[PDB]
Amino acid sequence: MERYENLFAQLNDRREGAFVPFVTLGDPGIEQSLKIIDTLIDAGADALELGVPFSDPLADGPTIQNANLRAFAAGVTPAQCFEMLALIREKHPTIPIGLLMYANLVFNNGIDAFYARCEQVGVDSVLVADVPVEESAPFRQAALRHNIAPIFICPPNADDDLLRQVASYGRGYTYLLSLPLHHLIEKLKEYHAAPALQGFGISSPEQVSAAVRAGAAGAISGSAIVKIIEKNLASPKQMLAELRSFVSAMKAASRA
Amino acid sequence: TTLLNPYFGEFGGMYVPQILMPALNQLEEAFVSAQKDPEFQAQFADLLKNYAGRPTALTKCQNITAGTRTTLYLKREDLLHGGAHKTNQVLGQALLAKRMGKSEIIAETGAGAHGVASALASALLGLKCRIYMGAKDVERQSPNVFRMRLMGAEVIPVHSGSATLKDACNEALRDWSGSYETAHYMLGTAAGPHPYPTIVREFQRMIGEETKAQILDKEGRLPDAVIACVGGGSNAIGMFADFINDTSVGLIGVEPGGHGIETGEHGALLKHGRVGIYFGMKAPMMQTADGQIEESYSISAGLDFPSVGPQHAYLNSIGRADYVSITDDEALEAFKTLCRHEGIIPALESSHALAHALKMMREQPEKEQLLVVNLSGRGDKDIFTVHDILKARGE
Numbered sequence A: 001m002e003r004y005e006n007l008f009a010q011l012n013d014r015r016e017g018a019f020v021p022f023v024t025l026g027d028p029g030i031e032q033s034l035k036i037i038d039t040l041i042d043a044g045a046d047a048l049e050l051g052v053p054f055s056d057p058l059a060d061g062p063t064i065q066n067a068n069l070r071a072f073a074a075g076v077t078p079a080q081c082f083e084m085l086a087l088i089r090e091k092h093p094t095i096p097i098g099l100l101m102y103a104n105l106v107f108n109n110g111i112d113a114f115y116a117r118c119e120q121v122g123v124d125s126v127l128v129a130d131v132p133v134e135e136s137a138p139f140r141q142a143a144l145r146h147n148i149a150p151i152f153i154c155p156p157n158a159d160d161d162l163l164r165q166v167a168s169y170g171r172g173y174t175y176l177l178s179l180p181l182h183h184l185i186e187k188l189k190e191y192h193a194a195p196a197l198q199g200f201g202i203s204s205p206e207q208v209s210a211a212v213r214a215g216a217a218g219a220i221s222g223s224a225i226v227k228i229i230e231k232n233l234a235s236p237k238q239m240l241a242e243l244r245s246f247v248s249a250m251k252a253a254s255r256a
Numbered sequence B: 001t002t003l004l005n006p007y008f009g010e011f012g013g014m015y016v017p018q019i020l021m022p023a024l025n026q027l028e029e030a031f032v033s034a035q036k037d038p039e040f041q042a043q044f045a046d047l048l049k050n051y052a053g054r055p056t057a058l059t060k061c062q063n064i065t066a067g068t069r070t071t072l073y074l075k076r077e078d079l080l081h082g083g084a085h086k087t088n089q090v091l092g093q094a095l096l097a098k099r100m101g102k103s104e105i106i107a108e109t110g111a112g113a114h115g116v117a118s119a120l121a122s123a124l125l126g127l128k129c130r131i132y133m134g135a136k137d138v139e140r141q142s143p144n145v146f147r148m149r150l151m152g153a154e155v156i157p158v159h160s161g162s163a164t165l166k167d168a169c170n171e172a173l174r175d176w177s178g179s180y181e182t183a184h185y186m187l188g189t190a191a192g193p194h195p196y197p198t199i200v201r202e203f204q205r206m207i208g209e210e211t212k213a214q215i216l217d218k219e220g221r222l223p224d225a226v227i228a229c230v231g232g233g234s235n236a237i238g239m240f241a242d243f244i245n246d247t248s249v250g251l252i253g254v255e256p257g258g259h260g261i262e263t264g265e266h267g268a269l270l271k272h273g274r275v276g277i278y279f280g281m282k283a284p285m286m287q288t289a290d291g292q293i294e295e296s297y298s299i300s301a302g303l304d305f306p307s308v309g310p311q312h313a314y315l316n317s318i319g320r321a322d323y324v325s326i327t328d329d330e331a332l333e334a335f336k337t338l339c340r341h342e343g344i345i346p347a348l349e350s351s352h353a354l355a356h357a358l359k360m361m362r363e364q365p366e367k368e369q370l371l372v373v374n375l376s377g378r379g380d381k382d383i384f385t386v387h388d389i390l391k392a393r394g395e
């Protein structure tokens, strides 16, 4: 499919940025995670980033570590996540769905078979957190054979060589983690990279507008959503209320 | 791009978030540079000799082989400062840190041995050292935690995941990804992302270099086999490296069989663990059917690592080295045997290597063979563990 390409062309026509929340699939359990995600979409998420619980998430901070722990406590498995993903795609035909994965869960039962399963359930992109571009070839190849965008992180400590490779090899969007912000954004455009989403510290509306003003296509809230989950474990009702309120505010901040 | 090959055949690599690549590239460049620098080599040699006590003895153990055609020597890394072989490479990695202008050290530890080695090297060379250790290990390893604190290291309990070594390994990398401009990550075994398997091998390889010169002097020929226990792989690769091109010399690695391969409670990953990608590398892992990383098990804390260094996986795959396992009971017997017959108390880790050598001898007592066991450490630390088993078993 071309879900990201379509999304970005539509947002551009509306002079709007993308707002993209991250959650862990299955946190705090399957039924509640499904409602959480539907709430995110109803409240105006333009795309999703979705994590699959992994034992050793070595790229993630405490909030996400704790989300994984909550999903394992609930017995959530990758197979059950893939069941969830098929259901989510079936409810929502055009929203781009991106996974955040660790390499072992992709390599475990074969790289090709992993991406084939992504294609079957209707995922659009995969970011493998612990695969640098230097090691990415077999993941990118399998991704593209199955119509999945391989997503690469452009770190604060990026250099020009890395900008060129990330521009060349990534598809869908480029994951920015903040040579000033405006230089990175400009150079990525110069090298015809996938549109940049700012993923560093996006926890309030002002950061969403800042990201768009700097020339990024949008922003990814890496952990703020999960924090709202964490905060409201004991009242799933209010959890949903607070999620809707936050996402709506954040999406509003992306509008022309 | 790297200066050196990050792979041993299909095994190894640099599977870390993009943010950490410049740290690994920096480290590799500094290592390559150091290896060509006579001044660095002279400083490392001076610490090895005058601080750690190198060369270590090569002891001929006559009582334990009496009435067989096995001649057995022990390479006595148990006599190194700190009482395990780990000291050699932490001194080299400390010197690399200083070479790179770093003034802080991060290290992971499970059993505590590497945390104590890192702390002593740091205190000597004036580096501020912080050690990540899973909460469950902290509780289990009071004596080593206290040694670390006496040497002025900060010990940071890790409460994420399973609260054990792999979790402390994750936290050390999280920290380094933010701090690498000022801090060096002092990885504790011949595993992890490149360049750490290469560095750790080269900063351990004096073990086999010495062994070779000492056996030539004493016996006038090379050993038939060198035998070493295998956690992550450092003491074994240190013994093996200088013998790799001596094709007549057997290289035998001994992994922990725990309660027995068939019980699933072990750390023998070369034959029994499926290849995965984790800890920054492609290597056999202890893991669930769906790819979650799991805990290994051994009577011996130091061998309880749920993977194995990639150069061992490679040496196995090409059949240059052979790997076996020894169970908790076997290792306990070998521990008792060496205490009583040679007056040396071996680390339970090292007792796995000795146990395999004893089986080589006992199974074929009229086979002529000249064996060296790498006695990677001393077993003072294991006397309470051994005590509790014996009393429970009614001994």
Ligand SMILES: *Cc1c(COP(=O)(O)O)cnc(C)c1O
Pocket (backbone or CB within 6 Å): B084, B085, B086, B113, B114, B188, B189, B190, B229, B230, B231, B232, B233, B234, B235, B236, B302, B303, B347, B349, B350, B376, B377, B378
């Ligand atoms: C740390 C340790 C080991 C196991 O680690 P390797 O990296 O495989 O050498 C074995 N023996 C002793 C005494 C140790 O301290």
Ligand SMILES: [Cl-]
Pocket (backbone or CB within 6 Å): A028, A029, A030, A031, A032, A033
């Ligand atoms: Cl639920």
Ligand SMILES: [Cl-]
Pocket (backbone or CB within 6 Å): A001, A119, A122, A123, A124, A147
């Ligand atoms: Cl798709």
Ligand SMILES: [Cl-]
Pocket (backbone or CB within 6 Å): B142, B143, B146
């Ligand atoms: Cl104590």
Ligand SMILES: [Cl-]
Pocket (backbone or CB within 6 Å): B177, B178, B179, B180, B181, B182
């Ligand atoms: Cl830094």
Ligand SMILES: [Cl-]
Pocket (backbone or CB within 6 Å): B217, B218
């Ligand atoms: Cl002589």
Ligand SMILES: [Cl-]
Pocket (backbone or CB within 6 Å): B261, B262, B264, B272
């Ligand atoms: Cl098994």
Ligand SMILES: [Cl-]
Pocket (backbone or CB within 6 Å): B271, B272, B273, B274
């Ligand atoms: Cl297997």
Ligand SMILES: [Cs+]
Pocket (backbone or CB within 6 Å): B065, B066, B067, B068, B069, B070, B071
């Ligand atoms: Cs003998």
Ligand SMILES: [Cs+]
Pocket (backbone or CB within 6 Å): B230, B231, B232, B255, B256, B267, B268, B269, B270, B305, B307, B308
């Ligand atoms: Cs092992």
